[PDB]
Amino acid sequence: VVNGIPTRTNIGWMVSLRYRNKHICGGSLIKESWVLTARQCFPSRDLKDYEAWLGIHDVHGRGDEKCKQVLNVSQLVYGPEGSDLVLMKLARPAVLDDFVSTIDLPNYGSTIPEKTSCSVYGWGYTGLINYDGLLRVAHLYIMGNEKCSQHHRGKVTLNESEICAGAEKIGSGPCEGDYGGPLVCEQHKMRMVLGVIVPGRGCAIPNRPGIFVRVAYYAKWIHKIILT
Amino acid sequence: KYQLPNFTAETPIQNVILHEHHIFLGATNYIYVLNEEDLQKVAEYKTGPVLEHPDCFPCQDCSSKANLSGGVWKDNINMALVVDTYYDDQLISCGSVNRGTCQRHVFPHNHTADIQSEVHCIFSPQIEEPSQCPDCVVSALGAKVLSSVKDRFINFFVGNTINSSYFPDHPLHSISVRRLKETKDGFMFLTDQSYIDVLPEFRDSYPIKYVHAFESNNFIYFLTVQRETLDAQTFHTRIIRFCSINSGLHSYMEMPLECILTKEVFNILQAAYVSKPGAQLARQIGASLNDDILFGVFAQSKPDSAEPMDRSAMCAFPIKYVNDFFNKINVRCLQHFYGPNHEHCFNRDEYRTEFTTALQRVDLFMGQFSEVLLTSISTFIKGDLTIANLGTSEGRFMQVVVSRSGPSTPHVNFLLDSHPVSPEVIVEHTLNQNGYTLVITGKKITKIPLNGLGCRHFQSCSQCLSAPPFVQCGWCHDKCVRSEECLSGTWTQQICLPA
């Protein structure tokens, strides 16, 4: 993540997806056997090549022998044609200690008020000479799409299935290696995954918000896949 | 002798792009910027002569070795030129020279002729698999590059003629698909299935010219000239088709194409444009007002060779039928990529299929052009009519009507600069069905209007009223032209006053 800071400790819903042994993508653990993530995360079709590490803080697991959980991937369920969502089934549930937790999800129709504060999380690119490998977090506020369209200056027009968050006046935000990661907000009381990181039109461009995928738009579908 | 918007550069023009009312020529050692409106040069950028060296690496430059122990000074032929607009608007250009290594010119947020102020070379150093070189895009000895946005990534599909200059750690690939990084500082190949390469053994035997590429209907297509079979004497044009995906080249198949006189075959494709048909042509060839057709200007081989004789014929393939021929239920295996022997080939995403028979179609000109070498084609609709824009090795440019029923003769025919006509061409429409073609000749680009022209050569009222009706000329007091292009309140197709 460009222009964010190290997370104090590790984060429960955070999943690193690994293709052919190196990390490639983020993922939100939404139920014991399901990681919600982006489609741009699967170069292979052969699920042998992948592996999902859970309850880590160091992208390479360096701090975290006492928390790490590595799981093979058993299923890929791609979401509707429009979306870049895909639901990953892991071959055996994650076991939920304090280091591994699921994130909540929105109700199907729900909105979010503007300037609702949020975070993106990731082990993707930080433009640093030597990234120490720890999870990074960048804070954004939710922008409306209507303004978000005008900030991107006519280049993009957002579907009711896309959602925006930016930081005021500066460049920060997710990037290569961050995708599939959660944009997480909170309002009601607790924490919900509200957008899913997908590739942008440039990382941390000063004063141009990030567009994420509205999970709310897809919650029905997600539930009918994960609830069982 | 016509009088047209006439820009001349100091070096030969390889390639041409029209973007936001400017024209970008990709030239030997140069990129130019002309104004769309009058073709005046607004800006240059010097990709200028460059120095080759074993020690001098591909994105770092050197007058820090100019004195040379075994290093040569080299001409920087433009091989590719892509405007990208998904990211912040940028010109991406790919030269022949530093192992085929593209740079991006980023337009400032108002001056569009500014190829100059912010330019980054694109070569990220290779660390996971130090064997690969995904920033080595283009081949000095023939490339076609087609870029398209897909899955929020900019994707580059790339045909490259390849010659067994075993380059340690910077090889090239015959076809391949790689995406940019959102960090804009490097291309990446998604998996090892994302390129298909001529086998090291045949890398010389003989090669694969890439004439044209285009995306349509969710496949990528390449047009190609190569080896009816390996070490097999005679040459040949194929289509190559594969699924439009980042993840790799998927449903790959090359199928031969045949143009014939009516068998008198034109086995060397020279140029090609892809467009929709007009009703007249539509009706005739299998139709669909809104269908993509591949117009291909072909040529006859000098026996046992790949070089073309001065014999031409053009003929048109609707891609809808191309697909049928690809899909329907026979099929060989990719002799130049697999062995002729070993598994997969003795068997039947995964497999790579050659076809044993061509899709043939007949000359649409019926030999009208069987004594000249057509080197460039382009196509447009006027009402019901479909019109070819043709170009020739002798320098002749000419507008013809395309038809089976009717052996039509060109209504425009004349000399552009003595240097041959280039297959690289631009057509751009404007409201109400006119527009222009940009046409490269040696080192000159000319802005030939699609429409008014076939009138301008009538030197007298009478003669003008006598022109072929479809061209729709009239007499405007002293000149001959179509109504929109006529100044005063007079204009006829019927009356000549006592002059």
Side-chain angles (χ1 to χ4, degrees), chain A, chain B residues 1-328 330-499:
Chain A
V1 174
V2 173
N3 280 333
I5 73 195
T7 65
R8 242 172 282 99
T9 173
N10 68 114
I11 295 251
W13 5 294
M14 267 333 269
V15 177
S16 152
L17 207 233
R18 358 242 294 161
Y19 170 71
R20 286 196 115 259
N21 283 298
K22 91 154 222 117
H23 148 95
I24 192 187
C25 255
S28 337
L29 168 61
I30 58 149
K31 255 197 176 75
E32 286 104 310
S33 262
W34 292 100
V35 183
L36 174 80
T37 184
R39 85 195 235 85
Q40 288 78 192
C41 294
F42 304 97
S44 238
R45 228 15 104 77
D46 170 21
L47 307 191
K48 247 128 227 204
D49 296 317
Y50 309 85
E51 183 156 296
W53 293 26
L54 284 259
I56 67 154
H57 196 188
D58 187 78
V59 80
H60 290 110
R62 286 188 256 110
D64 357 280
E65 7 277 335
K66 236 169 126 111
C67 10
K68 197 163 101 161
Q69 279 190 66
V70 313
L71 297 173
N72 284 303
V73 163
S74 87
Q75 270 160 235
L76 259 58
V77 182
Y78 290 66
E81 212 231 292
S83 67
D84 301 294
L85 286 200
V86 22
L87 280 165
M88 212 158 53
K89 227 258 214 115
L90 16 85
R92 142 174 349 124
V95 139
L96 319 175
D97 33 36
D98 302 22
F99 306 112
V100 173
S101 85
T102 74
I103 182 134
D104 269 15
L105 269 186
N107 261 50
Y108 166 48
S110 57
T111 20
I112 8 63
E114 242 153 343
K115 272 102 134 280
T116 299
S117 81
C118 304
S119 312
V120 295
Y121 296 83
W123 293 278
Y125 159 90
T126 60
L128 292 161
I129 297 156
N130 334 258
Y131 177 50
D132 54 275
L134 285 182
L135 191 76
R136 261 168 132 76
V137 59
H139 303 281
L140 322 152
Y141 296 89
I142 303 285
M143 207 156 301
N145 305 2
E146 207 210 89
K147 283 314 127 95
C148 189
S149 255
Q150 292 180 331
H151 266 260
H152 279 272
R153 52 193 357 194
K155 271 236 311 241
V156 222
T157 295
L158 310 166
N159 262 269
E160 34 172 307
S161 65
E162 282 172 301
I163 181 197
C164 288
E168 222 232 313
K169 297 250 233 199
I170 70 162
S172 76
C175 200
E176 289 286 340
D178 283 327
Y179 317 137
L183 153 93
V184 10
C185 302
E186 66 196 285
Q187 66 291 280
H188 295 347
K189 202 203 148 284
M190 43 272 254
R191 291 118 108 53
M192 289 177 172
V193 53
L194 255 64
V196 178
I197 295 157
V198 306
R201 289 155 107 128
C203 305
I205 274 117
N207 205 64
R208 192 204 284 354
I211 152 299
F212 306 67
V213 33
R214 216 145 108 69
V215 168
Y217 191 74
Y218 293 121
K220 214 125 243 246
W221 168 76
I222 306 182
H223 276 109
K224 139 240 204 65
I225 296 294
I226 59 115
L227 246 94
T228 161
Chain B
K1 177 215 109 247
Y2 295 121
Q3 142 80 95
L4 293 156
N6 45 210
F7 178 78
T8 307
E10 277 302 290
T11 88
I13 307 201
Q14 281 75 249
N15 284 316
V16 146
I17 266 87
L18 171 74
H19 170 74
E20 226 78 69
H21 311 315
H22 301 262
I23 287 194
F24 300 89
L25 312 149
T28 320
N29 291 306
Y30 276 96
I31 285 163
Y32 308 124
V33 204
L34 326 182
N35 251 316
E36 167 189 39
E37 207 265 340
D38 82 7
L39 295 240
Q40 207 104 53
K41 178 201 109 221
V42 178
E44 49 232 321
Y45 172 111
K46 3 59 179 51
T47 100
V50 145
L51 169 121
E52 308 271 28
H53 209 254
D55 294 45
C56 206
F57 270 32
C59 252
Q60 46 137 256
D61 95 61
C62 44
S63 26
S64 111
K65 240 283 114 188
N67 303 281
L68 52 91
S69 222
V72 69
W73 241 22
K74 220 84 229 154
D75 260 7
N76 195 358
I77 295 110
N78 188 255
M79 309 267 59
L81 191 56
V82 168
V83 127
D84 147 65
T85 237
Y86 187 59
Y87 290 165
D88 296 86
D89 301 19
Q90 39 174 214
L91 194 48
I92 286 164
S93 71
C94 310
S96 55
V97 91
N98 262 296
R99 241 316 138 271
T101 209
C102 309
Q103 37 195 229
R104 21 190 288 274
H105 312 255
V106 190
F107 306 128
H109 268 284
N110 235 51
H111 201 187
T112 299
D114 203 345
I115 290 321
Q116 174 95 238
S117 97
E118 174 185 14
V119 172
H120 315 263
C121 187
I122 309 186
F123 175 155
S124 188
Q126 214 59 15
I127 250 88
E128 307 300 309
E129 263 288 331
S131 348
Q132 272 320 114
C133 191
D135 302 315
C136 296
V137 192
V138 118
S139 143
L141 42 84
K144 277 276 168 325
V145 162
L146 150 47
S147 124
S148 94
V149 226
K150 205 116 217 232
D151 275 3
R152 292 142 178 306
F153 286 125
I154 295 150
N155 297 357
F156 275 56
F157 307 85
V158 174
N160 260 328
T161 327
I162 247 201
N163 117 311
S164 118
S165 326
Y166 182 160
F167 225 105
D169 292 328
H170 309 315
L172 291 187
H173 300 298
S174 250
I175 39 296
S176 42
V177 57
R178 77 293 289 295
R179 68 177 187 87
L180 244 203
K181 291 213 208 83
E182 203 191 342
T183 45
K184 280 177 257 227
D185 63 321
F187 296 87
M188 77 161 70
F189 289 134
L190 239 98
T191 67
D192 74 335
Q193 247 173 26
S194 302
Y195 30 86
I196 293 152
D197 280 2
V198 164
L199 277 181
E201 1 184 355
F202 323 103
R203 239 145 216 173
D204 270 303
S205 298
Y206 54 33
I208 306 170
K209 238 45 125 249
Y210 296 95
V211 196
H212 195 232
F214 63 92
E215 194 168 1
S216 142
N217 255 308
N218 253 9
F219 304 104
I220 315 290
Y221 298 79
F222 278 77
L223 282 173
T224 204
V225 160
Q226 35 127 338
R227 46 145 58 87
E228 207 161 274
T229 15
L230 42 208
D231 55 57
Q233 310 272 244
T234 151
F235 284 70
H236 196 36
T237 288
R238 303 143 174 225
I239 306 236
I240 280 136
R241 181 250 246 178
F242 47 79
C243 244
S244 170
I245 337 227
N246 245 320
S247 54
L249 304 147
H250 287 311
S251 267
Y252 191 99
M253 321 161 97
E254 336 197 305
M255 135 206 152
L257 284 212
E258 262 190 12
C259 204
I260 44 148
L261 200 78
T262 237
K263 279 180 195 179
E264 194 107 76
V265 208
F266 296 88
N267 55 312
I268 298 150
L269 174 86
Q270 290 296 312
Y273 189 84
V274 180
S275 77
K276 256 80 201 252
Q280 205 207 99
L281 220 210
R283 212 178 325 276
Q284 294 162 217
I285 35 85
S288 165
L289 226 259
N290 182 57
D291 238 303
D292 287 323
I293 289 98
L294 164 68
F295 298 100
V297 148
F298 292 79
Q300 188 170 75
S301 200
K302 280 168 160 274
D304 272 48
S305 112
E307 310 108 56
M309 256 175 91
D310 287 351
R311 275 200 118 227
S312 295
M314 171 255 147
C315 54
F317 303 76
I319 79 109
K320 130 239 264 245
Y321 296 146
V322 189
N323 294 329
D324 295 348
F325 214 84
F326 267 124
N327 298 334
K328 247 69 235 186
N330 175 219
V331 165
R332 228 195 241 287
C333 130
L334 233 81
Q335 227 132 117
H336 62 265
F337 151 85
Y338 289 120
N341 265 228
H342 240 56
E343 357 266 271
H344 324 284
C345 231
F346 248 35
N347 259 263
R348 251 292 168 191
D349 228 91
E350 303 283 284
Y351 358 47
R352 266 94 215 238
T353 30
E354 212 162 311
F355 270 47
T356 11
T357 54
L359 199 194
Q360 82 190 294
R361 296 281 136 127
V362 245
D363 189 351
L364 262 127
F365 288 129
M366 286 100 105
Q368 231 324 282
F369 295 114
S370 39
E371 284 205 88
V372 294
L373 204 221
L374 295 171
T375 51
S376 150
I377 175 164
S378 126
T379 271
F380 67 106
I381 292 159
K382 244 277 153 232
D384 289 22
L385 286 194
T386 286
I387 293 169
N389 287 302
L390 294 188
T392 293
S393 21
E394 217 202 2
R396 293 249 226 81
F397 170 89
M398 55 191 107
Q399 299 197 300
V400 193
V401 183
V402 192
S403 191
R404 291 242 81 94
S405 230
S408 279
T409 37
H411 44 99
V412 160
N413 185 330
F414 77 98
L415 240 264
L416 279 178
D417 285 282
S418 3
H419 289 10
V421 184
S422 157
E424 296 319 311
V425 305
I426 287 213
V427 175
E428 218 228 340
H429 311 273
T430 21
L431 226 89
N432 278 57
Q433 219 157 96
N434 45 267
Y436 61 89
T437 315
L438 296 153
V439 189
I440 297 125
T441 261
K443 44 234 277 258
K444 300 151 200 118
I445 183 131
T446 333
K447 196 189 188 193
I448 312 169
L450 294 170
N451 269 318
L453 207 89
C455 297
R456 285 180 46 204
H457 82 269
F458 293 100
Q459 230 46 227
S460 81
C461 183
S462 156
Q463 248 139 65
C464 181
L465 300 194
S466 260
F470 79 85
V471 179
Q472 310 175 99
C473 312
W475 191 253
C476 208
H477 183 252
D478 48 61
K479 56 223 262 189
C480 181
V481 55
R482 93 230 129 100
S483 43
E484 42 252 51
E485 207 194 306
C486 158
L487 266 51
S488 62
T490 171
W491 191 86
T492 23
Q493 258 145 329
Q494 286 149 67
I495 268 85
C496 285
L497 301 155

